[PDB]
Amino acid sequence: TRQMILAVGQQGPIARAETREQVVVRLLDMLTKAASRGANFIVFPELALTTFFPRWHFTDEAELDSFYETEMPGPVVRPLFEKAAELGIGFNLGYAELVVEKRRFNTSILVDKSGKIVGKYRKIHLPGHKEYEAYRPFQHLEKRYFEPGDLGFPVYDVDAAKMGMFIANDRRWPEAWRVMGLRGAEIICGGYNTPTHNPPVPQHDHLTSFHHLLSMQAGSYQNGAWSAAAGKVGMEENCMLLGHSCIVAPTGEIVALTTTLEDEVITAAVDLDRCRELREHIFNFKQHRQPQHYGLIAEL
Amino acid sequence: TRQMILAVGQQGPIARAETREQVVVRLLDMLTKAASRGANFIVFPELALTTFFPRWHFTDEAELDSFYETEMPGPVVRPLFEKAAELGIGFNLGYAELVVEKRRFNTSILVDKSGKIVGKYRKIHLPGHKEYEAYRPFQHLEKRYFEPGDLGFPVYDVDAAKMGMFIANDRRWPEAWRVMGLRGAEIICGGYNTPTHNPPVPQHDHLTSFHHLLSMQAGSYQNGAWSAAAGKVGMEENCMLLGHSCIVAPTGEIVALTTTLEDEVITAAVDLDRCRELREHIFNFKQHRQPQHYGLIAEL
Ligand SMILES: NC(=O)N[C@@H](C(=O)O)c1ccc(O)cc1
Ligand SMILES: NC(=O)N[C@@H](C(=O)O)c1ccc(O)cc1
């Protein structure tokens, strides 16, 4: 009822020449191993169907569009939904969304154990830069290839659980966590592509892991929420991406952690009633919060 | 100019029978050792002039009032201001404020190196409970003995530095940090009386340190602010108070930490320009924040 097993399916590199068909096989295998370890839900990474294309400057718009989905699911990704419904396991999938009216989003969905899309979220905090910067060995052009999401920070019923979505950079922003905490989220999940080199601030490179885990622990604790972060990790097209995919308790304790830079599955026992230990005491919102003093946070 | 040395003056226990006169001696000694180690400012704890009286139920209102200050400074505390002006060192002092119009506040002030009170703050987030609870070996009746502060989260010029104040429980609330981060605080400082036993949630007792330090590191990182937390610590009137008084860099790295449960002074080199490493890149607020999605945080 209130007890489930949450899984994270960390992805090793996806090369530029690796088809969605070859990625779906890798996702199917991880989704199968999570079932066999008793998982009811598995979190997959940000932009989980392709290489991280925002590392390149594009001149050809057909080449750029080829990394986006025009439908969800499409025939190549459909087998992942079919297998999820067969095994009775929900998932969180990140992908690049192209909607033609041409709007571009960094998107994620929640799929329940029936294989039904129960909710969508579009990345609101876009990191990196807008224009090509030649000094960078690799680019991070999310501000060019995506518009900021227009759906807000919703929380959806997924089987037994109140679940909210972040995408990568969102996890560093207390406002993203707090909104979803105020909407009663019991699990906050998403994925990331996080380089271990930041060209403008290389003096925080050795803190990549620290800053990632610090963000997940603080968000979980301050909102008494279970959380899970699914990385795409390792040497991808000669850029190193941070590992340390994780599941976190509402106390902010890390209860599971990846140790490889490859396809790796981790699981943890989730008790949704454990949110109360914070939300009815230390972080009893109605009882403690003084929102008349917080107005500057919501000012445009 | 943009470089200073920040000190923290951690306090061991203050017994019920220990006069303000005997505490000022202890504060003078710590303030002298900080000067000798090149400190330009020292952070002192919450309610630094008395035992932590909110651990007891009071029936007599004269007995309760005796723990509050009706003026700041008074003659007994005046020597601490005089010594601060002589040595050229500012301080942050917490005390119980009684103002008659009768209003009761958990208060802290910033004093610059001239010995002039440059800013006041009143604790906005009150923890614990309102009525006596007999099962508790000790009470935490801040909701009875204080009203929520009415000054907001201001940020003040103190010599070369933009400084904001929290008081104890405030440090667990992202909203307190964020408001002061948005007002351009370079240092966020205050003190705490944090029991290592929480009677309603004893299953988080072993996490007292973790939760304290997690709050300071995450606040600092997410706002690119220097921070400092001054504890009153050790066995005070048979209640154990958490140590681990700390200074933290804008990266959320702990740059100094106490290891005793006694009067202890720690210092760190503060470079106020280091805020830019976060505030001009990863946490470039104007460039990244989407406050149209954050409205629920400011709803009453
Ligand atoms: N994919 C993302 O949203 N990645 C960002 C993040 O994880 O917050 C990130 C972090 C460090 C960088 O050098 C670039 C981008
Ligand atoms: N002075 C304070 O505000 N103390 C509170 C805090 O530090 O958050 C606190 C923390 C844990 C408890 O079990 C009781 C009270």
UniProtKB/Swiss-Prot annotation, chains A, B:
Keyword Signal appears in the UniProt entry: no
Keywords for this protein: Hydrolase
Catalytic residues as annotated in Swiss-Prot or TrEMBL: E46, K123, A168
Gene3D superfamilies: Carbon-nitrogen hydrolase (3.60.110.10)
GO MF term set: N-carbamoyl-D-amino acid hydrolase activity
Stretches assigned to coiled coil: none
Residue ranges of every copy of the CN hydrolase domain listed in the record: 4-272
Swiss-Prot/TrEMBL catalytic activity: an N-carbamoyl-D-amino acid + H2O + 2 H(+) = a D-alpha-amino acid + NH4(+) + CO2
Highest taxon of the lineage: Bacteria
Disulfide bond annotation, renumbered to this chain: none
PROSITE patterns: CN_HYDROLASE (PS50263)
Entry's EC annotation: 3.5.1.77
The keyword Hydrolase is assigned to this record: yes
CDD domains to which the protein is assigned, alphabetical: DCase
PANTHER family recorded: NITRILASE C965.09-RELATED (PTHR43674:SF12)
Functional note: The enzyme catalyzes the hydrolysis of N-carbamoyl-D-amino acids to the corresponding which are useful intermediates in the preparation of beta-lactam antibiotics. Industrial production of beta-lactam antibiotics is now being developed using this enzyme.
Name of the protein in question: N-carbamoyl-D-amino acid hydrolase
Organism: Agrobacterium sp. (strain KNK712)
Lineage summary: Bacteria, Pseudomonadati, Pseudomonadota, Alphaproteobacteria, Hyphomicrobiales
